[PDB]
Amino acid sequence: RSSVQYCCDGCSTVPILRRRWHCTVCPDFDLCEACYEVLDADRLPPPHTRDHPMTAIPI
Amino acid sequence: RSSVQYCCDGCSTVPILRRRWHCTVCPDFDLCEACYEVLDADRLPPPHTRDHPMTAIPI
Ligand code: NI
Ligand code: NI
Ligand SMILES: [Zn+2]
Ligand SMILES: [Zn+2]
Ligand SMILES: [Zn+2]
Ligand SMILES: [Zn+2]
């Protein structure tokens, strides 16, 4: 079956499991826990920027 | 990001990797390689039946 899943925009892991750090500003941007913790601020995929508020959403 | 992935109707693994055994008759039915090889038809969710032709589709 076809299933909607969240894929990390930092590392392309899919599905993100347990929780996803979601951008409140971008249209459709999510990070897994590891990317949220380790991705460098100047290496975020544009147009996401480091000032965008992120929220932890249960999967 | 939101992403369409294939989820196995036999074991619920998602994404199916490599290839998916896809039902030609049902609306949206897929098995991973492992389920296709070892699950008996009585274990598969109605309305899928053993006479439905299945085709291997690369992921
Ligand atoms: Ni949102
Ligand atoms: Ni089809
Ligand atoms: Zn990631
Ligand atoms: Zn953003
Ligand atoms: Zn399976
Ligand atoms: Zn079927």
Numbering used by the authors:
A (entry chain B), B (entry chain A): 2611 to 2669
What does the paper say about this structure?
Among the >600 human ubiquitin ligases, UBR4 plays a particularly important PQC role, being an essential and conserved E3/E4 ligase found across eukaryotes. Aside from teaming up with various ubiquitin ligases, UBR4 activity is linked to two specific cofactors: calcium-binding protein calmodulin (CALM1) and KCMF1 (13, 16, 17, 20, 21). Our data show that the evolutionarily conserved UBR4 complex forms a megadalton E4 arena, in which inward-facing ZZ-DZB domains of KCMF1 act not as E3 ligases but as substrate receptors. The architecture of the E4 megacomplex is conserved across eukaryotes, but species-specific adaptations allow UBR4 to perform its precisely tuned quality-control function in diverse cellular environments.
We turned to Arabidopsis thaliana UBR4 (also known as BIG), which diverged from metazoan UBR4 early in eukaryotic evolution and has distinct roles in hormone signaling. Instead, an internal ZZ domain is found in AtUBR4 itself. To explore whether the plant ZZ domain displays distinct specificity to HsKCMF1-ZZ we determined the co-crystal structure of the AtUBR4-ZZ in complex with an NRS containing peptide. We observed multiple differences in the substrate binding pocket, for example a specific interaction of the peptide’s R1 residue with a serine residue in the ZZ motif, whereas the corresponding residue in HsKCMF1 ZZ is a leucine. In agreement with this, ITC showed that the AtUBR4 ZZ domain binds to NRA and NRR peptide sequences, whereas HsKCMF1 ZZ domain did not. Thus, the AtUBR4 complex could act as a traditional type 1 N-degron receptor, consistent with in vivo studies.
